[PDB]
Amino acid sequence: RRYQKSTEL
Amino acid sequence: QVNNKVLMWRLLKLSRPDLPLLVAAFFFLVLAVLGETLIPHYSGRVIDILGGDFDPHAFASAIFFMCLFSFGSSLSAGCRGGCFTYTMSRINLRIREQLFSSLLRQDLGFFQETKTGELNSRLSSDTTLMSNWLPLNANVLLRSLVKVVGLYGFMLSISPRLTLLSLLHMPFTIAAEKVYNTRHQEVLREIQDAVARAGQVVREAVGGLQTVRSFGAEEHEVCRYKEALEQCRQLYWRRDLERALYLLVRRVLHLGVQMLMLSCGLQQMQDGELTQGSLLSFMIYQESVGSYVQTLVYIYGDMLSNVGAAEKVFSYMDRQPNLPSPGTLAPTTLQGVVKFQDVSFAYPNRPDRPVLKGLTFTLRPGEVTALVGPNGSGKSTVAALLQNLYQPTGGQVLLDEKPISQYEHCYLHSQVVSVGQEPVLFSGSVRNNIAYGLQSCEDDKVMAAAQAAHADDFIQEMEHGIYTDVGEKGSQLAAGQKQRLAIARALVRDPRVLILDEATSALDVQCEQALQDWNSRGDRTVLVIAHRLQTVQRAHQILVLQEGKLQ
Amino acid sequence: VRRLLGCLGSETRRLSLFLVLVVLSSLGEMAIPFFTGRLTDWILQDGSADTFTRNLTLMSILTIASAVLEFVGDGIYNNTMGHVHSHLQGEVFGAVLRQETEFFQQNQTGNIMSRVTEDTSTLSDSLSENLSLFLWYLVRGLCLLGIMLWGSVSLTMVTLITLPLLFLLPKKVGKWYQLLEVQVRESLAKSSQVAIEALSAMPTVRSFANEEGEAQKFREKLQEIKTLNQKEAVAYAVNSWTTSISGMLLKVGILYIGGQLVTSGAVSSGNLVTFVLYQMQFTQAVEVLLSIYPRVQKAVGSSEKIFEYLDRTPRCPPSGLLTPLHLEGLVQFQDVSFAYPNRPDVLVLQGLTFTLRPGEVTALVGPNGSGKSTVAALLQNLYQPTGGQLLLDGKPLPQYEHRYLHRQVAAVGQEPQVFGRSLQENIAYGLTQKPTMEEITAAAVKSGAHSFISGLPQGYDTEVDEAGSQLSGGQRQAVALARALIRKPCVLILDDATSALDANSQLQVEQLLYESPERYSRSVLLITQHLSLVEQADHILFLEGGAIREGGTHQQLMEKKGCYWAMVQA
Ligand SMILES: Nc1ncnc2c1ncn2[C@@H]1O[C@H](COP(=O)(O)OP(=O)(O)OP(=O)(O)O)[C@@H](O)[C@H]1O
Ligand SMILES: Nc1ncnc2c1ncn2[C@@H]1O[C@H](COP(=O)(O)OP(=O)(O)OP(=O)(O)O)[C@@H](O)[C@H]1O
């Protein structure tokens, strides 16, 4: 598994 | 299609009054992209400088340009999200208010047919899904598209032979991302169906437990809920297997292109056509150009869902209401003659099913009128037609020798009031609920209305007098007190034609009748709806109602 | 608590194999930064092409063998956590259905709805997703720190001093920003409750010309958000500044110390590239673990509501064990007195005593209220009597088996609820075995529903939706009557059978009641307001005030000129 950073606004 | 083109231009016209914020936000977008793309170019130039002398005229220039663009990229990216979060909030509050104003003027047949579950999703969740179009989905798509071109602009400057091998494996990365995003949305839709299917099994068992225990089917409903979970569990495992298979493909492919360029790039550098500085600037770009293609394909998939979630709202807002033309007639002479002339009504939701069959009667202002009939005859439909809530299919309703749809909307409902069959109490205070819909009133009239309707006796039991807060839906007071509040809500308005619809409500109809004879004054028309004949008498006339026909 | 969260014990062989594959995958993943520092030292001092080939094939195998072991490790864990979540969710449904009947009246259905449907599914799916991420990055955060010590201690130690000094300001401002983000989401959802409250009562709003007033009330809630929204938008810009600046300032701090060290000849330039590449991967493993941990702490905080619901004990007595082969059908009341335990201060029923026998019909009549339908509730073991004794064939009701008793006692409710299923199974609800096709036809024959159900386009397989939309009140009575006739009950309860029945099925009701050949093995208790069936009843009792007032047969009671004489003359 790998963390996916929520997209920057 | 052209249907998506109008939704393109309609969503752009929504954000027109945010022009100075978009210009300042799109400035910081361009300033940040140019700031970051030049950073790895100066990274390799420092290393190439670090093979000779430490001359100030080139080494200190490259170091200063490193910190200036690192400051320029980070400071601009902070202000880009600052001006885009404020833009999305302004769009979100604009379309919430505009939708709720347009939903409030629809005809009453719209709310009967439409479930309340759908209107809550359009108001709460779909407005958020449409305000993400310009500040988020067009922000990321424009930022990633310019950056991808900028990375390939520098790669062509470094080595035109090496940048061709990046384009060869590209069509796989676009195709693999597009396949996975198609499959993932298909599964996540099937999850939503099977989750609500399991919740439908517990829907019947918990609510109708009395029928369940009457037949001993508790182990049956456990068996059906255990089976409905096994259908969900198969789809939960299918989503995780496909997701963990895509990561393994991405990790092998990423290593594959890293070895192809470390090997072939080194062979080119030993021939003298590349320097160590230009190789380091080439490798930093290549790790970054793969991560921007994946974002670009994923976001463009999500932009189509934002438009699709913005087409449900624009269809609810643009639906034409089925209402008569508004009237401007407000005479001061309103003695209150009500005439019915062969009226026939069919419900718009269920047409060709007649309720009224040519009713005809007349109300005199100084007298009392009573309506009696069996359950389901349609007494409450006569109450609804008297307040301009519907349009009769045949005949007409005459009020002071005028059709009832020809009056002003605020003036008529301030003179023809009613008490509902099932009273509804809102979430405001007691004083705000007695004077509901009134622009201005004094505290004396509110007290006097409670005195006339026997609501002042229990209003002093609980503290703060009439400023006590009521709970939501009115679930704080007794059922008997709720009818007294509803009755006092009618009388404070000083009405002209009065309609009381207790019907199944009893044990208080004689408390009202004993003080005032159905609150008949001598110039106020009173209509009382009851189920039993032995209850009125007071009424000057009586009109029995059977299957939509008067006797 | 974590001790009560000690489930999933039966799967400890499968979870241990996962924990051996995550460490093997974490050791083989870090070969990539190791063989970039050996290549950057190979170029700086030249060498054979064998060492280039040998260093590439070890980075070939270890990176490929690290992606496969993660994929095998991932699916294993995803297979087992699917079973644990599904087994517990089905386990919490068995507990609520075994609770007492009084749980389900005063408390809202929707409160029971939330705790079962999405307070367990979304709780488990959030926890199972956030536990593996905490488990994956802890081992990578621990295996990276192991080789940092082996590489060089001087630059390793200077990381740990500057780490908590650089990870206080990002989470202090990070705490402030998420406080403002949840204040917007609460005020946005609060305004939706105001708007949907006025929309569900549109006839009341329209009749008072208050469409303008409801638009002003909504515009007041939205104007409150905009005041606090400008401060929230600034707090997003400062949070993006502090995270970016503090992250970048860390990178230049370690480069200066390493550059001074590598220019003194203490370490080669190859080892500096490995260490810097480990610095970013170790920092990312800390900031991911710092964000996951509040989410896991939130999930276990809400897990105490589920386990309290599972651990509570029912108030009703447990089911009996006796299953006799044949029942005669005799039932008697011995001075019973029932009170609702929700308000035990009020005695709904008191002083009830009558006996029922097969072949005779006993009718219960009275006014509205006065515990009419409450007598039917006590007979089919829905509540326990506060006083008196209840006897069925010489035995008390809770001594009998739960499934067998309800198969021999059938009742018709005041408003018979119907479920959305096939009507072939809806007629044969709750049976231990599926009956054949003849009995459902025979049940429709004895109920009078066959004249309508055979006219359906699908007939016995006609689907019905929720709340019985595609049926009339009279057809709802007919579908319920056949449901109580398949099992051939020894004691039959008939409450409000003809509320909306004025057709041929009413004639079949009295034919079954008074002239059918099977009445001699059945006992019928009848509660309807139609006096035509009362005058033919073998026994008629009057109910008023929750007690027996007048009794006897039919003809014995008008000669007394009692309460039965009242509504007959009326
Ligand atoms: N909102 C509605 N939508 C569709 N049909 C309706 C609606 N309200 C009433 N009807 C129909 O109108 C008839 C009865 O109308 P109404 O509610 O005025 O009767 P009532 O006798 O005054 O009421 P009650 O049911 O309280 O005795 C029935 O055929 C019913 O199905
Ligand atoms: N869950 C409950 N909590 C409190 N009181 C209840 C509850 N269920 C029923 N009651 C009350 O107890 C009595 C039970 O109703 P009852 O047996 O008298 O029915 P009924 O109205 O006479 O029936 P029918 O509609 O067939 O004429 C009623 O007075 C009712 O208000």
Q: C74 to chain A, minimum CA–CA distance in Å?
A: 7
DSSP string over C129-198: HHHHHHHHHHHHHHHHHHHHHHH-HHHHHHHHHHHHHHSSHHHHHHHHHHHHHHHHHHHHHHHHHHHHHH
Length of chain C, in residues = 570
For ligand 1, is residue B380 a contact (CB within 6 Å)? Answer: yes
Residue from B276, B397, B411 nearest B342 by CA: B397
From the list B243, B223, B188, B236, the residue with the least C-alpha distance to C80 is B236
B409, C194: Cβ pair inside 8 Å? no
CB distance B84–A9 less than 8 Å?
Answer: yes
Q: Side chain identity at B405, as an amino acid letter?
A: S
Our CA angle for C489, C495, C497, nearest 5°, is 90
Calculate ∠ Cα C346-C348-C351, nearest 5°.
115
What resolution does the deposited structure have, in angstroms?
A: 3.6
Q: For C46, phi and psi rounded to 5 degrees?
A: 60, -165
Answer yes or no: is the C-beta of C106 below 6 A from any ligand 2 atom.
no
What's the CATH number of domain C331-569, 3.40.50.970, 3.40.50.300, 1.25.40.10, 3.40.50.9100? 3.40.50.300
Chain A partners of C288 at a C-beta cutoff of 8 Å?
Answer: 3
Ligand 2 pocket, mutate which of C340, C365, C383, C495 (most atoms under 8 A from CB) = C340
Q: Residue B176 is encoded by which pair of tokens?
A: 């693999």
Mutate to test the interface with C, among B94, B98, B104 (most CBs of C within 10 A): B104
CA-based nearest residue in chain C for residue B226? C90
CA B114 vs. chain centroid, Å, equals 14
CA distance C527 to C346: 23
Would you tell me how many other CB atoms lie within 10 Å of the CB of residue C415? Answer: 11
How many residues are listed for chain B in this entry? Answer: 551
CATH code for residues B1-153+305-323: 1.20.1560.10
Owner of token pair 């207790």: B502
State CA B247 to chain mean position distance: 36
* Adjacent-strand bridge partners of B497: B416, B525
**Whole-angstrom Cα distance, residue B134 to residue B29?**
13
What b-and-e string marks burial along B263-299, b requiring 16 or more CB atoms within 10 Å of the CB? eebeeebeeeebebbbbbbbbebbeebbebebbbbbb
Tokens read off for C110: 């929707």
What order do you get walking across the sheet with C355-356 strand by strand?
Answer: C355-356, C331-337, C387-392
With a CB cutoff of 8 Å and minimum separation 6, the contacts of B336 are B363, B365, B399, B400, B496, B497, B523, B524, B525
Question: What's the rounded Cα separation, in Å, for the pair C387 and C410?
Answer: 24
Residue B74 to residue C248, Cβ atoms within 8 A: yes
Every domain of chain B and the residues it spans = 1-153+305-323, 338-550
Option in A1, A2, A9 nearest B85 (CB): A9
The amino acid occupying position B220 is H
Q: How was this structure determined?
A: cryo-EM
Q: Among candidates B75, B212, A5, B139, which has minimal Cα distance to C430?
A: B212
Question: Could you tell me the two tokens for B461?
Answer: 């039991």
Residues B214, C413: contact at Cβ < 8 Å?
Answer: yes
Of C113, C199, C218, the CB nearest to B97: C218
Q: For residue C345, which phi and psi values (nearest 5 degrees)?
A: -70, -15
The residue assigned the tokens 């195709």 is B175
Domain B338-550 has CATH 3.40.50.360: no
Q: Could you say which DSSP state residue C519 is in? A: G
List the alpha helices (DSSP H) in C200-321.
202-206, 211-262, 269-301, 303-311
Domain regions of chain C by residue span: 12-152+267-311, 331-569
User: For residue B239, which of C194, C539, C74 has the smallest C-alpha distance?
Assistant: C74
> Which of helix, strand or coil describes residue B139?
helix
Amino acid identity, position C568: V
Sequence-ordered list of residues with C-beta below 8 angstroms from that of C119, at least 6 positions apart, any chain: C302, C305, C306
Amino acid at B457: D
Q: Give the span between the Cα atoms of B213 and B205, in whole angstroms.
A: 10
Q: Which homologous superfamily does the CATH classification assign to the domain defined by C12-152+267-311?
A: ABC transporter type 1, transmembrane domain (1.20.1560.10)
Q: At what angle do helices B39-49 and B276-309 cross, to 10 degrees?
A: 170
Tell whether C459 is in a known binding site. no
On whether any CB of chain A is under 8 Å from the CB of B303, the answer is: no
Contacts B–C by Cβ distance under 8 A: 220
Between CA C447 and CA C508 the distance in angstroms is 7
Helix axes B162-207, C109-151, angle to 10 degrees: 150
- Answer yes or no: do C104 and B209 touch at CB < 8 A: yes
Residue B372's beta-bridge partner residues? B530, B544
- Tell me which residues of chain A, numbers 1 to 9, contact chain B at a CB-CB cutoff of 8 Å: 1-2, 7-9
Residue with CA nearest ligand 1 atom 20: B378
Is-same-fold flag (C12-152+267-311; C331-569)? no
Distance of CA B536 to the CA centre of its chain: 47
Task: Give the number of C-alpha atoms closer than 13 A to the C-alpha of residue C470, restricted to the C-beta side.
Answer: 14
> For residues B485 and B423, is the Cβ–Cβ distance under 8 A?
yes
The residue whose two tokens read 């505009």 is B98
Q: Which of C422, C474, C479 is nearest to C450 (CA)?
A: C479
Q: Is C475 labelled as part of a ligand binding site?
A: yes
Backbone angles phi, psi at B166, to 5 degrees: -70, -35
Pick B93's closest partner by Cβ from C225, C240, C245: C225
DSSP state of C332: E
Q: Which of C495, C497, C482 is nearest to C378 (CA)?
A: C495
Q: Whose alpha carbon is nearest atom 19 of ligand 1?
A: B378
Q: How far is the CA of B541 from the centre of ligand 1 (A)?
A: 24
The amino acid that residue B219 corresponds to is: E
User: Which two structure tokens, joined as six digits, stand for C193?
Assistant: 């409750």
Measured distance CA(C331)–CA(C405) in Å, rounded: 13
Contacts with B354 (C-beta within 8 Å, 6 or more apart), sequence order = B344, B345, B346, B393, B548
Does the Cβ of C372 fall within 6 Å of ligand 2? yes
For B90, the closest chain C residue by CA position comes to: C226
Q: Are the C-beta atoms of residues C320 and C402 closer than 8 Å to each other?
A: yes
CA of B543 to the centre of ligand 2 (A): 34
Instruction: With beta carbons less than 8 A apart as the criterion, state whether B450 and B465 touch.
Output: no
Q: How far is CA B238 from CA B42, B183, B246, C71, C79, in A?
A: 47, 11, 13, 14, 10
CA–CA distance, B398 with B404 (Å, rounded to integer): 6
Q: Which chains touch C (3 or more CB pairs under 8 A)?
A: A, B
- Is A9 in contact with B77 (Cβ distance < 8 A)? no
CA distance C263 to B185: 54
Residue of chain A nearest C133, judged by CA positions: A1
Q: Which two tokens stand for residue B102?
A: 């347009």
φ, ψ for residue C485 (rounded to 5)?
A: -115, -10
For residue B87, give the chain A residue with the closest CA: A9
- For residue C18, give both structure tokens: 């996962």
DSSP code per residue over B269-326? HTTTSS-HHHHHHHHHHHHHHHHHHHHHHHHHHHHHHHHHHTHHHHHHHTPPP--PPP
A9 touches chain C (CB under 8 A): yes
Separation in Å, CA of B11 to nearest CA in chain A? 19
Binding site per annotation, positions of B: 373-380
Task: Report d(CA C342, CA C552) in Å as an integer.
Answer: 34
- For residue B487, count other CB atoms closer than 10 A to its CB: 23
Q: Is C433 annotated as a binding residue?
A: no
Within 406-445 of B, beta carbons closer than 8 Å to C belong to 409-410, 412-414, 417-418, 420, 424, 426-427, 436-437
Distance CA B232, CA C19 (A): 27
Query: Is residue B48 within 8 Å of residue B165, measured between CB atoms?
Result: no
| A1: chain C residues, CB-CB within 8 Å | 70, 74, 132-133, 136
